[PDB]
């Protein structure tokens, strides 16, 4: 997919997405694992992920 959408994603968003989806170490991480990873709440990670996904939906149009 490279960019052209992943390009519009911020650094936090791209990183949260890759860790969550298994794109970093080939393993999917829970919201809690990612929150503890960066030191933020489960909910904050959900918020960043949902926003990243909405941005991907936009640039797929």
From Swiss-Prot:
Residues 31-50 bind DNA. Residues 5-57 are annotated as: Sigma-70 factor domain-4. It is found in: Cytoplasm. Transmembrane segments: none annotated. It comes from the Bacteria. Belongs to the sigma-70 factor family. RpoD/SigA subfamily. Sigma factors are initiation factors that promote the attachment of RNA polymerase to specific initiation sites and are then released. This sigma factor is the primary sigma factor during exponential growth. Interacts transiently with the RNA polymerase catalytic core formed by RpoA, RpoB, RpoC and RpoZ (2 alpha, 1 beta, 1 beta' and 1 omega subunit) to form the RNA polymerase holoenzyme that can initiate transcription. Contains 4 domains, connected by flexible linkers. In the active conformation, the domains are in an extended conformation, each making extensive interactions with the RNA polymerase catalytic core. This is RNA polymerase sigma factor SigA. It comes from Thermus aquaticus. The lineage of its organism: Bacteria, Thermotogati, Deinococcota, Deinococci, Thermales. The chain holds residues 368 to 428 of 438 of the full protein.
């Amino acid at each position: 997919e490279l960019e052209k959408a992943l390009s519009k994603l911020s650094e936090r968003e791209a990183m949260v997405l890759k860790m969550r989806k298994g794109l970093i170490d080939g393993r999917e991480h829970t919201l809690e694992e990612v929150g503890a990873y960066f030191g933020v709440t489960r909910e904050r990670i959900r918020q960043i992920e949902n926003k990243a996904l909405r941005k991907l939906k936009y640039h797929e149009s």
